[PDB]
Design a protein around this ligand. Sequence first.
Ligand SMILES: Nc1ncnc2[nH]cnc12
Ligand SMILES: [Mg+2]
Ligand SMILES: [Mg+2]
Lengths: 257, 264
Amino acid sequence: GMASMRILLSNDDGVHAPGIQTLAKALREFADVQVVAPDRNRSGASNSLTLESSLRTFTFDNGDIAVQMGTPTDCVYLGVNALMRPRPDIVVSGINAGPNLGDDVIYSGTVAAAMAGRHLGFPALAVSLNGYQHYDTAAAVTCALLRGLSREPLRTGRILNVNVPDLPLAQVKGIRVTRCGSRHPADKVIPQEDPRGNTLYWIGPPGDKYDAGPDTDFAAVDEGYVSVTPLHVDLTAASAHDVVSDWLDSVGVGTQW
Amino acid sequence: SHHHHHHGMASMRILLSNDDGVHAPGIQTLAKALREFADVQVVAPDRNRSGASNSLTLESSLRTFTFDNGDIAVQMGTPTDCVYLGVNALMRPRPDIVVSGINAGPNLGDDVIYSGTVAAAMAGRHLGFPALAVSLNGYQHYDTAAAVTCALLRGLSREPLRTGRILNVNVPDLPLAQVKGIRVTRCGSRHPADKVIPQEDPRGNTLYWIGPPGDKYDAGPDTDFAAVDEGYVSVTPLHVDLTAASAHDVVSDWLDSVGVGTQW
Ligand SMILES: Nc1ncnc2[nH]cnc12
Ligand SMILES: [Mg+2]
Ligand SMILES: [Mg+2]
């Protein structure tokens, strides 16, 4: 083949995570892979990034790069813009231990790292396992996608959010393009007293599934299919445009009459 | 009955947060304005968290500190933690709405997915009134951003806003008299940011700064960038759904075409 694929691999769980190390191993059978990922498994970074401080990096013997206290986004940013020359063809983020579905996606560091490689020659993949077991299956599904992208370019969609059923590969039904489901608002806080009687608060579990119908990511994964949802960064709720303009006129905001 | 700019000194309960933290001039100016006519509770980060984006604290609990005036700082809390805790635990009576702001600096374009200002408003989307994220295009005219936010809040008192759960509001950094009006906008977009600034530590290790956002790419006439450049307050309604609906078919055809995951 005329060209090697050069892949920037990141994740949310840090460089030591088995999900990213399993995927790296699988990708390296056919691709060049540079890992740039958080130094440790931190929870809940979303697409935060480090602006108030400079970031420190560390290179392992195998060449993996960990960014110290780096967010998922930090790592992809540094990887694309400084640490990999020339720039990667594609950012692959995963494999995440745990699903990234529905309206959770915006909170996902795994998705954020992909999000950050949306301007490369291929659409970025965010890869999450619905579980902790079959990294092998998600690795294989990722490999298949990537061979697919190199066979024919995907013309529209700069980020693909891929959720893989936690099954042995032979039981995965196939792949469906899906939209993000939704959840009810999350509302649990779990209070816990410290030894001095002060109340500290844990953020609780997500809200219950609300939109999990036939074409959602939630449905696809439950039915044993890989879910693929293309994502974009534009948060515009266009359907609300007229209602909002009409409301402002109605309440006299921005207009004198 | 009596004629005043606002009807009631505490007609609505507002959870006010931001991402610059509880000491920020943005939030303090706004708080003072809102307290004219609203029952305001500040729940905000203990310090600056710009580009905390929608992150949240899941593997540790959080501790709060309450100031003399009743402001709550969530110690190391992200803007999302603050709203989530304020809404779901701390506030009684619960808020009618979340206001987030006034941020020192704009939250325009494809930057909005990175804004902690916007993330706090996004955590308040389920409440009765749409959550407002208010960011000043600059550092000067907090007064102007406060007047704008007060005008939208009074407006919500006149008539509820039916569709649209977050409103991202950018306000030109001008005296109020020079703001031309309001536009309902769409998010513009930027080129990829591409600068990384290296800086040696005292030991000669190279550390890296994240550079500024990339150039404007789409600043067309109905965008938030254009509105603010032209001296209008931009209001973009936002959602949290990241699905690229208009890419669905293309992706679907692509998969069929290369046959990934299908036997033949
Ligand atoms: N990629 C990026 N996105 C948002 N804000 C930034 N500031 C610097 N780089 C940025
Ligand atoms: Mg994770
Ligand atoms: Mg800020």
